[PDB]
Each structure stands twice: as structure tokens, then as C-alpha cells.
Specification:
part of a larger assembly; 4 chains; alpha+beta; four-stranded antiparallel beta sheet; binds a molecule of 2 linked components (NAG-NAG); binds 2-acetamido-2-deoxy-beta-D-glucopyranose; Spike protein S2 (chain D)
Amino acid sequence: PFAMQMAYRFNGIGVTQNVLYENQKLIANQFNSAIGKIQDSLSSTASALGKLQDVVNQNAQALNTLVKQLSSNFGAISSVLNDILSRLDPPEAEVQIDRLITGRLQSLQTYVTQQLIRAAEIRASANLAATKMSECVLGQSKRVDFCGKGYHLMSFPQSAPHGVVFLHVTYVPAQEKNFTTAPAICHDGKAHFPREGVFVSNGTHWFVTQRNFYEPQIITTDNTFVSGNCDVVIGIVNNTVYDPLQPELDS
Amino acid sequence: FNGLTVLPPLLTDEMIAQYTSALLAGTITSGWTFGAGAALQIPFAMQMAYRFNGIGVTQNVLYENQKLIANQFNSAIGKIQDSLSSTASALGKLQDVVNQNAQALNTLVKQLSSNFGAISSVLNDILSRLDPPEAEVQIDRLITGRLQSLQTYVTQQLIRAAEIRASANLAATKMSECVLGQSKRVDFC
Amino acid sequence: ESNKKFLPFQQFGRDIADTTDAVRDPQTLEILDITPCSFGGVSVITPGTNTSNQVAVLYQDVNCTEVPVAIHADQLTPTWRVYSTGSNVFQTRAGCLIGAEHVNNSYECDIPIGAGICASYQTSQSIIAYTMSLGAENSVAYSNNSIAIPTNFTISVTTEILPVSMTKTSVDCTMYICGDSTECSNLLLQYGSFCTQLNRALTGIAVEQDKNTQEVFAQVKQIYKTPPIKDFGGFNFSQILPDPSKPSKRSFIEDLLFNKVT
Amino acid sequence: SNLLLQYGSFCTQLNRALTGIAVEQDKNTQEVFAQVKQIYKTPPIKDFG
Ligand SMILES: *[C@@H]1O[C@H](CO)[C@@H](O[C@@H]2O[C@H](CO)[C@@H](O)[C@H](O)[C@H]2NC(C)=O)[C@H](O)[C@H]1NC(C)=O
Ligand SMILES: *[C@@H]1O[C@H](CO)[C@@H](O[C@@H]2O[C@H](CO)[C@@H](O)[C@H](O)[C@H]2NC(C)=O)[C@H](O)[C@H]1NC(C)=O
Ligand SMILES: *[C@@H]1O[C@H](CO)[C@@H](O[C@@H]2O[C@H](CO)[C@@H](O)[C@H](O)[C@H]2NC(C)=O)[C@H](O)[C@H]1NC(C)=O
Ligand SMILES: *[C@@H]1O[C@H](CO)[C@@H](O[C@@H]2O[C@H](CO)[C@@H](O)[C@H](O)[C@H]2NC(C)=O)[C@H](O)[C@H]1NC(C)=O
Ligand SMILES: *[C@@H]1O[C@H](CO)[C@@H](O)[C@H](O)[C@H]1NC(C)=O
Ligand SMILES: *[C@@H]1O[C@H](CO)[C@@H](O)[C@H](O)[C@H]1NC(C)=O
Ligand SMILES: *[C@@H]1O[C@H](CO)[C@@H](O)[C@H](O)[C@H]1NC(C)=O
Ligand SMILES: *[C@@H]1O[C@H](CO)[C@@H](O)[C@H](O)[C@H]1NC(C)=O
Ligand SMILES: *[C@@H]1O[C@H](CO)[C@@H](O)[C@H](O)[C@H]1NC(C)=O
């Protein structure tokens, strides 16, 4: 199910999946609105496709130059072959014709060399596009800013004239808040560290929250792991770490 | 001064240094989270615990050794200082680039001192010694040769620039996945 | 006047390019350094003409002490008819910029000029040049016990565009050079394989472009199809999934893309 | 120069190629460095653990 896929890919960026399920409608709406925004961004901004357009122009431009090079004398009496063929005998027309060949050959070699270099550049771009389709569509990539800006969620390919367009769906955290943090907590001399997440405080109590989405949970021995003791960590703060077993083993 | 100009780069070295200062300050105060959204401040110790956890070492390792990692980091930076300030060849890869370009330009300029079969390598000399019907041939040989030299120069520049573009794309990739975040790709960073 | 100490027998000091760089004057045996008359490139800064016709001019790597004394007496190969110098002539490391008003304010680059100077068409509309801003300043409220944690998110769908292939051209070398001329073709035959290796190179390019598209797209073994019902948890995909109604099964966004590049 | 004019656009496409190279180098530095939207600054105090 696609919902569970999205929970997968939320878990893949450090956000516990419950975040997805409890907000499913909200992510759904943001995704739909984002697609609409892509619609309009294309349908209005002409330059959005510059990178493809440029390619076309370059090739077209080169061809034009090539063709125009047939209108140059290169030192010959005329740029038209049949003109010389119809005006001079072979012993003299040979020299003019030779100048035309030398020039046209030089122009053609220049054209081919520019094409070779441009094709190498395009091959570099296509290898990068294949890499992005492999690690970016067919899977979820942890490489920062390689697929999209923000944490990657998924990516959808689309065709385009002589190129490809990826719609990179990425997760970007939005509304942050300051809290007082602390690397560890002294409960009974021990120093409990976060199992996953950080310790935060809203000014009065201490919570352990996951990395990337403020969801505070009461601090529990299931949230933290003990290591060492108080006197070695720099910045450790006193607090109490609730342990689940005691209320059962008291009632 | 044969029409061989060197345009200035768009971003002055000052602006580039400002950029690297920005990336540094973000990496220090905020971590990788300024490469995704807006920079989120976080104590640097806890950042280091983050990035220890990111390589399979439980973070308690960092906190209980914090002084020791701090000293090793400072000593390592000092070692980088000295390694640069003594070894001249450390920057070869940049230096080479410069030389190559400079060298090419020199070759280009030197190519103006060749006859290519003409009576002389100086244009004004021929202009001042022969009438147009005969000076035309000498001048034509000079143009053919100088054009061939210039095309050669431009083609080598195109290839070298493609190589540099490959290197800059790799540098951008490293800044993205290597500064702005922590990379699991072995020996890539 | 120069200080190149010619020894009494030398007459023409020489430059790397074998152009004479100093000369001992034949009448008064004195040395003269010969510096080529100040020259440079002239670049034209224009907002797109479909917006405005007023432009600025950059004289590249030329102190514009020389530019006025050259134009006001008409020492130019440009040889303008309608040219005007203001009091807004401005000096940058890239050269002297004429017709753009120096502005203390700094915005993002619009038209690069170099050395951190960027020009733009901005307001009375006019051409202005400034020192481009690098981005908004922002000090991070860093403290040794303060952490900023997000409380919300945003699913942002960026778009990113990559070339994959390019038009598979092919040049018929012998017809290009020697169009329908047996004589010219016979002359060409003396150059040997100069004309077949070009065809081979271009053929290599073309087959490589087919390889490019193959690699980029044909990464799936089987052709999948989405089920008839679009029950994807509320996410709307009709915008990117192919539409049945259009002759080539191309989705809406694919259609816009194919309508732009042409 | 008049003799050169007979070679057609051999001399303008060189200028175009070199201009392409130069603008590409500006693009290179842009891509490598300008990857941050805002200019951050480290705080006055260097209390980084
Ligand atoms: C910090 O958060 C805690 C828990 O969310 C708050 O403690 C609760 O505060 C409400 C009123 O805001 C009381 O009704 C509850 O009894 C409190 N719970 C406990 C266990 O004491 C605390 O008020 C918050 N402090 C600040 C400054 O926001
Ligand atoms: C956390 O609590 C412990 C004890 O519960 C505090 O340890 C005390 O520290 C002072 C200062 O050195 C000593 O005079 C006391 O004898 C210590 N008490 C014990 C039982 O050893 C510790 O200071 C508290 N942490 C903070 C940050 O206040
Ligand atoms: C998380 O952010 C979303 C939007 O980014 C918030 O959803 C909006 O809530 C306001 C109410 O103030 C509504 O007017 C908007 O229509 C909502 N937008 C959407 C797309 O549904 C949401 O309230 C935020 N959640 C929290 C806990 O702050
Ligand atoms: C998914 O989104 C499309 C639009 O991209 C929806 O199609 C629209 O449907 C409404 C009626 O609900 C019509 O008024 C619009 O004209 C339709 N737009 C287009 C372009 O056809 C579609 O109904 C949505 N489906 C779901 C399940 O959300
Ligand atoms: C955190 O506190 C600093 C203190 O000046 C403040 O500038 C900043 O805006 C605060 N962060 C948030 C998200 O309010
Ligand atoms: C943070 O710095 C303050 C000084 O401003 C100091 O009193 C405090 O002990 C420090 N705490 C940590 C955890 O670094
Ligand atoms: C360009 O000018 C034309 C008027 O000839 C106008 O129709 C068009 O909207 C303009 N384009 C832009 C992008 O402003
Ligand atoms: C231009 O010439 C003036 C003196 O006429 C000098 O002060 C100034 O430094 C020169 N500009 C440059 C870039 O050398
Ligand atoms: C910029 O401001 C300074 C004052 O700080 C002033 O002297 C200078 O003339 C201004 N520049 C322009 C182009 O007006």
C-alpha cells in the first residue's frame, strides 16, 4: 500500500513512521498542492527547461555554422563548385577546387571535433541521469542534496525532448523551536543517554524526542541506555528516569 | 598584448571566502540540518555524538572521551598547518592546472614567431616589402598557420575545460554529501 | 623613454612573439619602448530588447582615462553615430562601465559583469550596476545548551532537468565537400581516409546517443501498469500517470515539457 | 583582415567557444560554493566543546 510505502520512506530519514500515519491527510494535501505548483511553474516560466533547450540550440547552431561555411571563398575564385567547373579547365580549376576542399575539410573537422566534445559532455550528463534514476527513483538515497534539497522521500521520472525530468519529493522541516538540551542525565549516578533522539526541555521538564520532529516522550529506561556514571560527561543534567516495571511491581 | 585577455572571475576571492565561511559556520553551529531546511542550532558536542552514532559507534563513546577527541582534533589541525606550510608540492593539483593554462598560452604566443613557409613571421614586414598580388600569398600562409595554431589551442582548452568541469562536479558532490551532511560512501570523503 | 640598456651595437629590442618592442632611434641614438596602443574588448550589457532598448557598455580591462579621450575625438573602430557618455561612468576591475549607474545597494546577480559586479535593469527605469549580494545574512543562535527542533514539515516536490541525448546527426562527408562533382571527388581521394573517419566518428556519436537513452530509461525489465483504481492513500497521481485520452500515452506534465522545448 | 574574411565564420566560432568556456567556469564556482542560501556567521564565543 502506498501509505505504508511512505511510512517506509519516512523511517528511512529518521522520522518514526507514526508521524506519517497520524498526518496522512496533511502530507497528502501538501503533495497534491506541490504537484499543482509544479504544473504552474512549468506552464508559466518558459526558461524552466533551459538545460534541454540549450542543447538543441547548440546542435542546431553548429549545423547552421557548418552550412554557412559553404558560402566562403577560402581564397578560391568562388564558393560555388560548379561555377569553377564551368569556367576553368582542369589544370587551373584544380587549384581553386583544392583550396575549397582544404577549407571545407577543415570546417568539417572542426564541426566533428566540437560534436565529439559536446557528445562527451552529454554522455556525462546521461550517466548522471542514469545514476539518479537508479538511486533516486528505484530507491531512496541518503546522499545529501544529490536527489533533492531536503531529505529525500522519493522521485518520479518524466520524459522530455532529449532529456529527463525528475520530480524529487523531499521532506523539509518547517517550524522549529528552541529548547534547552543536555547530552545525558544522571538518575542514580548512572548517565542515561538517548537511545534515539535528543533530550530537550520546555523549561521545566525533560523529554526525549526523536531527531527531526518534535514529539516529546516521558523519559523511560526503554528510551535511554545507561553508560558509565555521572562525573565524566560534560554538561550532564540531573533528572529522574521513569522505569516502567516499578508501578506493576508495586501494585 | 596580442588580443590575449584574461577576464576576471565573477566571484572575487573575497566573496568565495565569505561562502566558505558561511558553510563552515553552518556546519559548526547547525550540523547537516542546514543543508536540508533552515539551520537548526545544536551544541557541537551533541553534533559529534550524532556523527558518532552515524558510524556505528554508540554516542556514549564521544561524551566519555570528549576531551580526548577534542585534543586529537586540535592536534590534527595543527598537523595540517605544518604539512601545508612545509611541503610545497601539497597543492600540486591546483598548481598543475595553472601551469598547464599558462603553458598553453605561452605556446600560443610563441607560435607568432614562425614562418609557416612565409618569407617572414612579421606581418608588417611583408606589408612593407611586397605589393598586394605577391604579399597576398605570404600573408595567406601566415593566416593558415596562425588559424591552425589557434584552433589547436581552442581544442586543447575545450578538453581541459571538460576535465575541469568533471572535477568541479565532483567537488560540488563532495561539498553536498561531505560538508552539508555525513556520507556513508567508503573512502569517498 | 625606457631603460632597456642597449649595448652600443644593438638596435631592435625584441619581444617574445618576435615583434619589436624597443628601438634605438637612428638620429639620436636613444632607446624607445614601443607599447601597443591601448585596446580591448567592448561588451554590451542589455536587458532583453523585448523589455527595453537602453543599454550599457563595458570596456574590458581598460582604464577609462583612455575611453573618453578616444571617443570624444573619434579614435574608435566602433565609430558610433549615436553615442553618449554620462557622468555615471564607473570603474570596475573588469574595466570601465559606461551608461550604468553605480548603486550602493546590493541585490542578487542579474547580468554578470565580473569581479563581483553584477548589472540589472531596475528603477524611471534605468540600468544599474552593483556588488552582488551573496545571500541574506543570518547569525545562528548557537549556544552550548540550545537545540532547535522542528515541529512541522513540508513535502516539497522540486523539479530537476537533465539532458540525455542529442540529435543523432550524420554528415555525408563526400557530398558535403564535393557536391555531385566527380572531379572534386577525385581530388578528395588524394586525402585518403580523412573523409571516412569523420563518418565513423559521427556514427559513433549517434549510436552512443541511443546507448544514452537506453541506459537512462530502460532500467526496468518488465512494463508495469498502475491498477485501474487510484486509491493511493489520498495522494493524487493523475498529473504524472499517463492519460488514456491522448494519442501517445503521455501524462500532463510530460505534455507541457514536450510543448516547451519545441 | 580582408584576407581572413574569406574564411567565413572560422574566427567567430573560436570566440564563441572560449566564451562558452569562461561562462562555464563561472558556473563551476557557482555550483561548488554557492550551495548555501543564507550567509551564516559563527557566534562571538568559541565554546564548541
Ligand atoms: C512543559 O511541558 C510539561 C508537559 O507537557 C508541562 O507540564 C504539564 O503542564 C500542564 C499545564 O501546562 C499541567 O496541567 C500538567 O499537570 C503538567 N504535567 C506535569 C507532569 O507536571 C509544563 O507545564 C510545560 N512547561 C512549560 C513552561 O511549557
Ligand atoms: C545532581 O544530584 C547530585 C546528588 O543528588 C548532586 O551531587 C552533589 O554535588 C554537590 C556539589 O559537589 C556535593 O556537595 C553533594 O555532596 C553532592 N551530592 C551527593 C549525594 O553526592 C549534583 O550536584 C546534582 N547536579 C546538579 C547539576 O545540580
Ligand atoms: C503543520 O503545518 C501545516 C501546514 O504546513 C499546518 O496545516 C495548516 O493548518 C492551518 C491552521 O492554522 C490551516 O489553515 C491550513 O489549511 C493547514 N494546511 C494544510 C495544508 O492542511 C498544520 O496545522 C501544522 N501543524 C502544527 C501542529 O503546527
Ligand atoms: C486528482 O487530481 C485531479 C486534478 O489534477 C482531479 O481532477 C479534477 O477533478 C475535479 C473534480 O473533483 C475537476 O473539477 C477538475 O477539472 C479535474 N481536473 C483535471 C485536470 O482533470 C482528480 O479528481 C483528483 N482525484 C483524486 C482522487 O484526488
Ligand atoms: C531561539 O532563541 C534566539 C535567541 O535570540 C532567537 O533569536 C531565536 O529566534 C529563537 N528561535 C526560535 C525558533 O524562536
Ligand atoms: C555552557 O556555557 C556556560 C557559560 O556561558 C557555562 O556556564 C556552562 O557550564 C556551559 N555548559 C555546557 C554544557 O557547555
Ligand atoms: C515581450 O514583449 C512583448 C511585446 O512585443 C509582449 O507581448 C511580451 O509579453 C513580452 N514578454 C515578457 C516576458 O514580458
Ligand atoms: C586608472 O588611472 C588612474 C590615473 O589616471 C589611476 O589612479 C587608477 O589606478 C587607474 N586604474 C587602474 C585599474 O589601474
Ligand atoms: C555609498 O555611500 C557612501 C557613504 O557611506 C557615499 O559616500 C557614496 O557616494 C555612496 N555611493 C553611491 C554610488 O552613491
